[PDB]
Amino acid sequence: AWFHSHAFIHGH
Amino acid sequence: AFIHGHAWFHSH
Amino acid sequence: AFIHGHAWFHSH
């Protein structure tokens, strides 16, 4: 699974 | 799984 | 599972 952050980590 | 938090993170 | 990475992260 991939997650992105730009902080909160986005992605399920 | 979602990753919660933004340092400690929590994931189930 | 471990969270890889330092922006994109990945976990399997």
Added chain:
Amino acid sequence: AWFHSHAFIHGH
């Protein structure tokens, strides 16, 4: 499961 970061994320 808890993960810690100072970024690399540490924890299983």
